[PDB]
Amino acid sequence: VYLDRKLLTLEDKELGSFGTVKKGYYQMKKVVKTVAVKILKLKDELLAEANVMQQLDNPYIVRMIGICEAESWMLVMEMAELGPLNKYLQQNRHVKDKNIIELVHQVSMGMKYLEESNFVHRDLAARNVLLVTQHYAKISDFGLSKALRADENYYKAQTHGKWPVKWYAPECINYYKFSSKSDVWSFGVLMWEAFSYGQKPYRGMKGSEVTAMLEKGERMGCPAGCPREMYDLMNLCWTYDVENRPGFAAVELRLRNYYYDVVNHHH
Numbered sequence: 345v346y347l348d349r350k351l352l353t354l355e356d357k358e359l360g361s362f363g364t365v366k367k368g369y370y371q372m373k374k375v376v377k378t379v380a381v382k383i384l385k386l387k388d389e390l391l392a393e394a395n396v397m398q399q400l401d402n403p404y405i406v407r408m409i410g411i412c413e414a415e416s417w418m419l420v421m422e423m424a425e426l427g428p429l430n431k432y433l434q435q436n437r438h439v440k441d442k443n444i445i446e447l448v449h450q451v452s453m454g455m456k457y458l459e460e461s462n463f464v465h466r467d468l469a470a471r472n473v474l475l476v477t478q479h480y481a482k483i484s485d486f487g488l489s490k491a492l493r494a495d496e497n498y499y500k501a502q503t504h505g506k507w508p509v510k511w512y513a514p515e516c517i518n519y520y521k522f523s524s525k526s527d528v529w530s531f532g533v534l535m536w537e538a539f540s541y542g543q544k545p546y547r548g549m550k551g552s553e554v555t556a557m558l559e560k561g562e563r564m565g566c567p568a569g570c571p572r573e574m575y576d577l578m579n580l581c582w583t584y585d586v587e588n589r590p591g592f593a594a595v596e597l598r599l600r601n602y603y604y605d606v607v608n609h610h611h
């Protein structure tokens with residue numbers, strides 16, 4: 345869990361800027377490992393994000409190496425070299441439909457594991473999905489994540505914090521209730537972003553205008569060239585009624601079966 349500052353080498357060039365993300369190298373027992381380091385320079389929030397990540401073990405979720413207490417509080421993670429999925433797709437508009445399906449299916453597998461483990465992510469967006477390879481996605485950014493109480497299937501927040509409203513379900517907005525079904529709503533927005541090659545959702549609209557549009561039963565249109573079955577799935581993720589909205593087990597199954605058909609049809 346606690347790492348030696350002497351064994352960490354930080355590169356001066358910053359990956360992101362929320363906080364700062366730096367590429368680094370950490371000397372392990374024999375080999376050196378490439379890492380991405382979250383720097384604080386708020387201290388209890390980093391420790392709680394570390395607390396969440398240490399409990400998670402899945403191929404589709406970013407692996408935490410440990411924490412470092414030196415100049416600043418640092419969260420050291422295994423490096424996903426290709427970066428955020430939204431920026432990747434913005435810069436690589438030639439990515440095939442079968443490939444986007446493959447990646448959003450990998451996110452659903454990671455979320456199906458988070459659901460089973462009774463953790464709510466609460467920041468599922470394309471900017472928080474990292475690419476290991478063009479064919480391998482991992483979920484990151486557990487800063488807002490919560491381990492659900494054993495007797496409840498939702499987390500209740502106290503007062504509006506720093507929230508990404510465009511990705512949030514109506515029960516999150518109106519009742520401050522976060523469940524794995526509210527993460528399914530964000531997964532629908534993330535899917536829309538993915539088939540829109542990293543375009544921002546609800547472009548040019550204020551959070552309040554997004555709320556009002558959703559309350560009238562309106563939803564973002566079908567992205568250019570997005571498969572119909574995938575757009576039907578987003579709409580099912582955007583079911584207003586929490587009870588009728590599918591869970592991640594159901595969403596993953598639809599993605600699995602559809603992806604196996606696309607792979608078949610290809611060759």
Ligand SMILES: CN(C)Cc1cnn(-c2ccnc3[nH]c(-c4cccc5c4ccn5C)nc23)c1
Nearest residue numbers: 359360365380421422423424425426427471484
């Ligand atoms: C808002 N969150 C996305 C911040 C955050 C949290 N974890 N985390 C990373 C964890 C593991 N592997 C990574 N790899 C890259 C990376 C690689 C290449 C380019 C990149 C990035 C990040 C920005 N850019 C432009 N970031 C990470 C980044």
